[PDB]
């Protein structure tokens, strides 16, 4: 139904960097971005390297007005698209990746002055729940929040504080699950801030003492949408599901710490081939991991998915950018196949009384 | 499908009449009350009155262990039956009638030091819903908790306390309704007694002032039960939902502040005479109260109802005990109409495949 749709984002300088005048190797012309050497005098190695992408947001400087993408620019290009497909009753994913350090949770959460995809993604969500409920349409929103680290799952809006680590498990009806994960009806904006708010703070406090290992954990934020249709004059209603998964990856950069990130690359090389019509024949490593596992209907599967690959433009960091930037490349030929999550007892309805009008005037012979 | 249960219920002589060493004129003999006259020397209006009923209980003096119901014995005779309906997927009802004074709230929900119906209720519901989850049934719970005084009907839950009043609306798929009133999602006994506490101090605060105009206000506590049903081996799912609603009445006794009391015995009449086959063409009057109109599924609907009439012993009450146990004997002549609330369109595909397969061999010809 659908290609991965892929952005980049361009980090400004840090403060490191600034000190140092380091060099920036990273341009971004309309939706190409063009990687520029570091050694230049090389006959290959030290040439650009250009990549298109669906888009591109340059965040250097807010001061050049005519190129500069803020938080707002990225919700209006990729926020507002996620938002729509929800309430569509699809699934839909945005998840960021790249290297510790390039952007990945500023564009997904945020800071408290600059709110990211999902404080801007909870707000547009309730203002046009709030501006479409009547008398033919209601609505429902639930949250979950989740981290990953290590291969092991934990609730970020747990009430206790045990930090203790849930089973995943498979269920022929629900799809891979998290046994025992919350999921909170929230009826406003405050609601689903307050559980943000926790669920950041469990975060955080979980990077207290190990910093450089909070770098190697996922994060999995899940709106589900649940849209009732009244159909008033026949005295009937039904449900539409869109679930929105915002899901801020561990660092890609260089035991089974990384399983998960190993895994993904797997998952979205292999996908990539298939797409391009290569290794049609072999099986997607889903299984291999928790987040892969978690996550196959976002890649190749039953979900509108947009990836964030976000990269720093300094000349130190450009190995991991090019990585950033040829997973990225591939991830834009994966084919995912989403639905519309309604009740299918409808079309059953629909094709029994098809088929029985057929039989009918069959019978008429 | 069922008749409205009755139960009585007989409280202990208040400090008033322990003073006065007030005569009492109700006695309970297993499912028997008998109403002794006052005036001892009368041929008739001063001669014993017997009424029989599905339940008594003697709540007089807790000394006489052999006779006297407790709020437990109240709860596994009652409640647990009608926790027993929600579980099935029915619509069930509790509704406390009688005088100022007699026990209705008592019943219903009880002091911090003897709970009452409600929260028992509560506590086994969610007991019950953790002990059975597993992988073919999970569990939802919504909470609703509203006042109707002076036909205008509020949220008790309501987050700001403005005390504004909801209108009361029709709707064909959900039936009448209050639009507005806050529907929320409890995981636990502790966030439904939060918001238990909430309303009942929302009772409290408008009963500050206006005490005796507290005693004219209905309250009604609605519990719906969603049980999913997971089709594991065809990977399928469904809902069967069941709602119960706890309604603690305004004072039975002697502009429209008692419409809705008013129109629920009219309403009641109506259902008894119909249940014994007098008046079967005239229609109830559900409509011209708030309170009737809201409830109408709960008596002569798609509901399972028990009805306590509460009672004082006491000589001085006799003209309103009298005529509260005339209404429970009208009430126990009510039919109910209950059925399971599932999802009409697994019927529908059963229906049309056997149509399918009497069309196909009838076209064997
Ligand atoms: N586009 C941007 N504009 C301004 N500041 C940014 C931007 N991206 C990242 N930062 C800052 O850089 C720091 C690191 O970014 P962060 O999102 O934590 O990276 P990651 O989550 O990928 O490790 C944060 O303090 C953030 O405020
Ligand atoms: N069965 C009972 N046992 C003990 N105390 C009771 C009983 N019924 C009522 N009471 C007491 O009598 C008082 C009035 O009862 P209440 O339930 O408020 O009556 P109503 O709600 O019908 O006006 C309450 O303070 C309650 O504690
Ligand atoms: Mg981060
Ligand atoms: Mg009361």
Chains 1, 2 share one sequence.
């Not at 969500?125 to 479409?132: A, C, I, V």
């Not at 970020?156 to 504080?161: F, H, M, S």
Request: aromatic share 6%; proline share 3%; glycine share 6%.
């Amino acid at each position: 139904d659908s290609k991965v749709k892929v952005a980049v984002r361009v980090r400004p300088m840090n403060r490191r960097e600034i000190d140092l005048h380091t060099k920036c190797v990273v341009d971004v012309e309309a939706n190409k971005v063009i990687l520029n050497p570091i050694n230049t005098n090389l006959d290959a190695r030290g040439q650009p390297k250009i990549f298109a992408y669906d888009h591109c947001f340059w965040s250097m400087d807010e001061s050049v007005r005519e190129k500069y993408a803020g938080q707002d620019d990225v919700f209006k290009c990729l926020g507002e698209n996620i938002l729509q497909n929800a309430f569509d009753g699809y699934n839909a994913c945005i998840f960021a990746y790249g290297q510790t350090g390039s952007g990945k949770s500023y564009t997904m959460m945020g800071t408290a002055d600059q709110p990211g995809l999902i404080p801007r993604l909870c707000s547009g969500l309730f203002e046009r729940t709030q501006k479409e409920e009547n008398e033919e349409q209601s609505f429902k929103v639930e949250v979950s929040y989740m981290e990953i680290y290590n291969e092991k799952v934990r609730d970020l809006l747990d009430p206790k504080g045990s930090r203790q680590t849930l089973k995943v498990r498979e269920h022929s009806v629900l799809g891979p699950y998290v046994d025992g994960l919350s999921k909170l009806a929230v009826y406003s904006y405050k609601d689903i801030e307050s559980l943000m708010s926790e669920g950041n703070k469990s975060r955080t406090v979980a990077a207290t003492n190990m910093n450089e290992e909070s770098s190697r954990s996922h994060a999995v934020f899940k709106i589900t949408l649940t849209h009732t249709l009244y159909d008033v004059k026949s005295g009937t209603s039904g449900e539409k599901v869109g679930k929105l998964s915002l899901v801020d990856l561990a660092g890609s950069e260089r035991s089974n710490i990384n399983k998960s990130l190993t895994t993904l690359g797997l998952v979205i090389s292999a996908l990539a081939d298939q797409g391009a019509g290569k290794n049609k024949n072999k099986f997607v490593p889903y299984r291999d991991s928790v987040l892969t596992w978690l996550l196959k209907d976002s890649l190749g599967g039953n979900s509108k998915t947009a990836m964030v690959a976000t990269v720093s433009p300094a000349a130190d960091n450009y190995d991991e950018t090019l990585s950033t930037l040829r997973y990225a490349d591939r991830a834009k030929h994966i084919i995912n196949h989403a639905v519309v999550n309604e009740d299918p007892n409808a079309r059953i309805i629909r094709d029994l009384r098809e088929e029985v009008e057929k039989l009918r005037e069959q019978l008429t012979k």
